[PDB]
Design a protein around this nucleic acid. Structure first.
Ligand SMILES: [Ca+2]
Ligand SMILES: [Ca+2]
Length: 757
DNA sequence: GCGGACTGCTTACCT
DNA sequence: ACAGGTAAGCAGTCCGCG
């Protein structure tokens, strides 16, 4: 099982290190043979010996092309002749590349910004996390003495928790008598002790929650102040911070630093992303939070260190338990994309697709398009037409069937062979022409992406067949992750086509997919209404809600499956319409906003205030109960009484503050905001007090009794006190509870004023 | 000028 | 930022009024 790669420099020459785990043992293979390179397209070969003479200085050393061999490749299908320029050191590439491009003979240069370690993985055809090799993991968390407006790392670490499958222990430097605590000399000894625990346990995976930003960064400042060599590396190195866009990443060589935060953020949609919130989402059990003021008060006083120690233990235990839950699916993602778990666990869906394509491009001798520069990125600023959203038939309706296409965008990309290499090819025989947009895609030969997408669809069939004929419950879960992850990768290619930073960006490809999508959903609706007896209530993009008005359940279901038997043969290649489900009643509010109740009585909610985090629990909960009254039961009168029960309780100040918290995200640097609002105003105040506000930070706030701009009386839910502060009953009634219900109860004929206490 | 209509910024959903 | 389509809060600005 390959874990990761990197390189070290020995006497000016690059040396690859492959971090393997084979036969229950960690190993480092060294490769001194592999050479860095990029490609150059020349106007004429006669110029090669002039471009070989081209030189550059890199930090006191003349960088020169080691050699050049001419190679034949494909660029977007068409064969191309380019010169593969080799260099002695991978760092030679950044120094030389700009000059070799500037040279008058050189039309362009290609594949010049591929990190050496990853160039090796691809070129050698190596896939990390292969085999059935069991890895040992250690989770760890830290507790600190934080004070308001304090610099980072000024406060000493109070406790270092760690947890695995066998134990969960705290390490601190105060006298705490509980079984799992370890009292040491000082802070210095506590840190040196943890290093010895890691050395002794030699774990293959370190697990943190947001360690990339807080935990590891904190320990490096502490170590430097204490003059400690922080040696977790199996090679004996210190953990290295690697910038990752607007955030950092900590790498520990020989081990896998598995930070759950980026994983949880990409996989689960929650109001907040606290350990306590995530643990409750994933496992269902609760976990209480200890606060910084309580922590410092418990240390300075020495009164209640035992509760602060339990929190530190439950942190590490929970982090390990989440570690074990998420690591397996992420290790499959690593195999599929063919990059380290570390890289893939922190990577956006753009980079995952791009890494996959780079690997497959190499296998198929396809030269990779360059990432766009400032002025080319500028040209891709334009948008394009998306999905077709039908204006819904508002109100309550009976006997509703949901029909939708299966993988419509992948179906279209494959069926119509949508790829940049097949776009407007000079002299084909057969063509598919996109409706409205009018781009022509060659049908003579398979396109790069279409072909890869065919491979994935069939690869997925094999896995689902292999899944049926296998008992081992663990092997079944690991193949279930592979097949689910293939599905996601496949559904990412359309979006990737329209992603301006993408190497294989193709607006024409993206446009044509959406256009065909609109043709098929609109054709299905037209057929369903004009020829069959259906009224289409709502249709978004690739799916529709239909009924036959003067008919019953049995009839609507039977006629729907009959329409599938009719239409699917008339639909080309992959394109196939499917019966998702029947619903006894359905309530369509607006575009993107509806609710349905099935045979069992389960209400499915889409788009309504119930699902959004930027609405208070009191409004979401109240709406949930108004909706249930009108779907589940037939009681429009019950719905009105619950509106009264909510509003009256709010004006008496009875509804508890937990149900008043509104969650909005900070999505840019606080200075980039052009318009202020409750969450931004709250976040700017926290910033002035020296609280860390990075993009992704969720602001949780409560509105206090007052008038005028909401932001002026918006404070963190943390700092809410019934002692001094008083919550705005009027606001939560007229701005939250009433708007949420009016949407549901507007249809029957109630105005806001008629639902208030 | 008042006060409601309107609209840009912004978020978070849907597919 | 993997895409565009969409509704709606907030806080400014707009604009109709007798
Ligand atoms: Ca549905
Ligand atoms: Ca078909």
């Amino acid at each position: 099982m390959i874990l990761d790669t990197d390189y070290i420099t020995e006497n000016g020459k690059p040396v690859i290190r492959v971090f393997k785990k084979e036969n229950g043992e960690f190993k480092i293979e060294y490769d001194r043979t592999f050479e860095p390179y990029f490609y150059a397209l020349l106007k004429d070969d006669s110029a090669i010996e002039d471009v070989k003479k081209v030189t550059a200085k890199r930090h006191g050393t003349v960088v020169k092309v080691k050699r050049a061999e001419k190679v034949q490749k494909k660029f977007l299908g068409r064969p191309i002749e380019v010169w593969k320029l080799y260099f002695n050191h991978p760092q030679d590439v950044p120094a030389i590349r700009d000059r070799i491009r500037a040279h008058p003979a050189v039309v362009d240069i290609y594949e010049y910004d591929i990190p050496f370690a990853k160039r090796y993985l691809i070129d050698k055809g190596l896939i990390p996390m292969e085999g059935d090799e069991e890895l040992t993991m250690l989770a760890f968390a830290i507790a600190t003495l934080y004070h308001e407006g304090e610099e980072f790392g000024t406060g000493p670490i109070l406790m270092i928790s760690y947890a695995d499958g066998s134990e969960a222990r705290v390490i601190t430097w105060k006298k705490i008598d509980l079984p799992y605590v370890d009292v040491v000399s000082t802070e210095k000894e506590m840190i040196k002790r943890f290093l010895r625990v890691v050395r002794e346990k030699d774990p293959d995976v370190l697990i943190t929650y947001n360690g990339d930003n807080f935990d590891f960064a904190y320990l490096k400042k502490r170590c430097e102040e204490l003059g400690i060599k922080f040696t977790l590396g199996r090679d004996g190195s210190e953990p290295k911070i690697q910038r990752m866009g607007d955030r950092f990443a900590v790498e520990v060589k020989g081990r896998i630093h598995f930070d759950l935060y980026p994983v949880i953020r990409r996989t689960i949609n929650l109001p907040t992303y606290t350990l306590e919130a995530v643990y409750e989402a994933v496992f269902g059990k609760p976990k209480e939070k200890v606060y910084a003021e309580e922590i410092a008060q418990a240390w300075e006083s020495g009164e209640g260190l035992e509760r602060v120690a339990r929190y530190s233990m439950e942190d590490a235990k929970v982090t390990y338990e989440l570690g074990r839950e998420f690591f397996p699916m992420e290790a499959q993602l690593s195999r599929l994309i063919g990059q380290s778990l570390w890289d893939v666990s922190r990577s956006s869906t753009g980079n995952l697709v791009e890494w996959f394509l780079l690997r497959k491009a190499y296998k198929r001798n396809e030269l990779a398009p360059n990432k766009p520069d400032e002025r080319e990125l500028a040209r891709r600023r334009g948008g394009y037409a998306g999905g077709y959203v039908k204006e819904p038939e508002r109100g309550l309706w009976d006997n509703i069937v949901y029909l939708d296409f299966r993988s419509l965008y992948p179906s279209i990309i494959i069926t119509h062979n949508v790829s940049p290499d097949t776009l407007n090819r000079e002299g084909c025989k057969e063509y598919d022409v996109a409706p409205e947009v009018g781009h022509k895609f060659c049908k003579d030969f398979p396109g790069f992406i279409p072909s890869l997408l065919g491979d994935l669809l069939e690869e997925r069939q094999k896995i689902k067949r292999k899944m049926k004929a296998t008992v081992d419950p663990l092997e079944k879960k690991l193949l279930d992750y592979r097949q689910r992850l293939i599905k996601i990768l496949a559904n990412s290619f359309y979006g990737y086509y329209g992603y301006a930073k993408a190497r294989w960006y193709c607006k024409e490809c993206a446009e044509s997919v959406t256009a065909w999508g609109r043709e098929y959903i609109e054709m299905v609706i037209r057929e369903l209404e004009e020829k069959f007896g259906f009224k289409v209530l709502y249709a978004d993009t690739d799916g529709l809600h239909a009924t036959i008005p003067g008919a019953d359940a049995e009839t609507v279901k039977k006629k729907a499956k009959e329409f599938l038997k009719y239409i699917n043969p008339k639909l080309p290649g992959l394109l196939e319409l499917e019966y998702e489900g029947f619903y006894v009643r359905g309530f369509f509010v607006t575009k993107k906003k509806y609710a349905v109740i099935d045979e069992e009585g389960k209400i499915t909610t889409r788009g309504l205030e119930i699902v959004r985090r930027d609405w208070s629990e009191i409004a979401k909960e109240t709406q949930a109960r108004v909706l249930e009254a009108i779907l589940k039961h037939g009681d429009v009168e019950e719905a009105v009484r619950i509106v009264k029960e909510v509003t009256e309780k709010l004006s008496k100040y009875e509804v508890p503050p937990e149900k008043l918290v509104i969650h909005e995200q900070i999505t840019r640097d606080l200075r980039d905001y052009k318009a202020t609002g409750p969450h931004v105003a709250v976040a700017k105040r926290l910033a002035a007090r020296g609280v860390k506000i990075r993009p992704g930070t969720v602001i949780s706030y409560i509105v206090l009794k007052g008038s005028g701009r909401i932001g002026d009386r918006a404070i963190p839910a943390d700092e809410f006190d019934p002692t001094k502060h008083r919550y705005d009953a009027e606001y939560y009634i007229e701005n939250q509870v009433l708007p949420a219900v009016e949407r549901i109860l507007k249809a029957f004929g109630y105005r806001k004023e008629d639902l208030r206490y």
